[PDB]
Scaffold this active site. Structure first.
Site, PDB file in Angstrom:
ATOM      1  N   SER A  47       0.802  -1.236   0.000  1.00  0.00           N
ATOM      2  CA  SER A  47       0.000   0.000   0.000  1.00  0.00           C
ATOM      3  C   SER A  47       0.820   1.264   0.000  1.00  0.00           C
ATOM      4  CB  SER A  47      -1.017  -0.006   1.120  1.00  0.00           C
ATOM      5  OG  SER A  47      -2.047  -0.943   0.866  1.00  0.00           O
ATOM      6  N   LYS A 214       2.771   6.710   4.901  1.00  0.00           N
ATOM      7  CA  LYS A 214       1.943   5.690   4.255  1.00  0.00           C
ATOM      8  C   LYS A 214       2.522   4.327   4.531  1.00  0.00           C
ATOM      9  CE  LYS A 214      -1.469   4.037   2.173  1.00  0.00           C
ATOM     10  NZ  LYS A 214      -1.307   3.031   3.262  1.00  0.00           N
ATOM     11  N   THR A 215       1.693   3.459   5.086  1.00  0.00           N
ATOM     12  CA  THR A 215       2.030   2.066   5.390  1.00  0.00           C
ATOM     13  C   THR A 215       1.805   1.161   4.190  1.00  0.00           C
ATOM     14  OG1 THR A 215      -0.249   1.872   6.221  1.00  0.00           O
ATOM     15  CG2 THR A 215       1.459   2.242   7.849  1.00  0.00           C
ATOM     16  N   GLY A 216       2.384  -0.042   4.274  1.00  0.00           N
ATOM     17  CA  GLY A 216       1.953  -1.157   3.464  1.00  0.00           C
ATOM     18  C   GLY A 216       2.258  -2.458   4.141  1.00  0.00           C
TER      19      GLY A 216
END
Length: 277
Positions: A47, A214-216
């Site tokens: 993500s 922003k994570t993923g």
């Protein structure tokens, strides 16, 4: 007597010696890469690529003089139940009207997969996002999948980057006039408002440090390997200066908690080094 780069490098290497994962790091401050780790590796973004999508959306909106509050129709068919979607959960089984700004907030701050793919369609497909990023001079990256395509195919390698290209992109978004200031201000804010991965870059920093990120994350196989566990963004130092950091944990046998703690520990090494300097 060592440079900030040397200190960060040394501390990362010591931290990772016994970790069962391949970790990529990049740090950029004052238009200069400060340090890297495993920067030649192509990491699956998961993500994190929603940041790149958001830039392409803001570019398109800016070119058209489209307001952040302008409402669009989203059909229930676009809000699929078989994927993570806080928006669908809130407004299930219905067609909606929703602003492009709110779609961006769900995509970036909440990591919603349906809103991501709605926004990719808005810009004309993933190839358009890819072309946008490359038009900014980002080289060692490729974006070839929607969330849907990654889910149906399983091919999470379709969206990849080196760590340094992510921090370079974050820095360009801050420094360059990619779009009007109202769009930049909105992106910074929604980046700060992210609610996922509070135990990743932010996990060992003092509570008042502002982080926009922003994570993923991938799935983990029954054999126990998690393909990706990522976080990337900006951190605001006490003098207001930002730095940019990306940490990508790939092919990991560590637990979810321990993967997040790798990210948090790297983030703290970097923060304390740059804040001491």
């Amino acid at each position: 007597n060592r440079t900030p780069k040397q200190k960060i490098e040394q501390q990362i290497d010591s931290l990772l010696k016994d970790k069962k994962a391949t970790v990529g790091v990049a740090v950029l401050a004052n238009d200069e890469t400060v340090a890297v780790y495993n920067n030649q590796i192509h990491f699956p973004l998961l993500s994190v690529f929603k940041f790149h999508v958001g830039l392409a959306v803001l570019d398109k909106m800016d070119k058209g003089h489209i307001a952040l509050d302008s409402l669009i129709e989203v059909k229930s068919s676009q809000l699929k139940s078989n994927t993570y979607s806080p928006l669908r959960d809130k407004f299930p089984d219905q067609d909606i009207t929703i602003s492009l700004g709110e779609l961006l907030k769900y995509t970036i701050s909440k990591s919603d997969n349906n809103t991501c793919d709605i926004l990719i369609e808005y810009v004309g497909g993933i190839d358009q996002v890819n072309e946008y990023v490359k038009s900014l001079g980002i080289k060692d990256c490729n974006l070839a999948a929607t969330e849907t395509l990654m889910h149906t195919s399983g091919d999470t390698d379709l969206n990849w980057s080196t760590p340094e290209e992510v921090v370079r992109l974050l820095n360009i978004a801050d420094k360059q006039p990619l779009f009007g200031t109202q769009y930049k201000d909105f992106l910074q804010a929604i980046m700060q408002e992210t609610s996922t991965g509070k135990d990743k870059l932010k996990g060992q920093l003092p509570a008042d440090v502002i982080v926009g990120h922003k994570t993923g994350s991938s799935d983990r196989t029954p054999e126990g390997i998690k393909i990706a566990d990522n976080d990337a963004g900006f951190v605001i130092l006490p003098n207001g200066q930002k730095y940019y950091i990306a940490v990508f944990v790939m092919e990991s046998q560590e637990t979810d908690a321990d993967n997040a703690a790798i990210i948090a520990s790297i983030s703290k090494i970097v923060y304390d080094t740059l804040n001491s300097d």
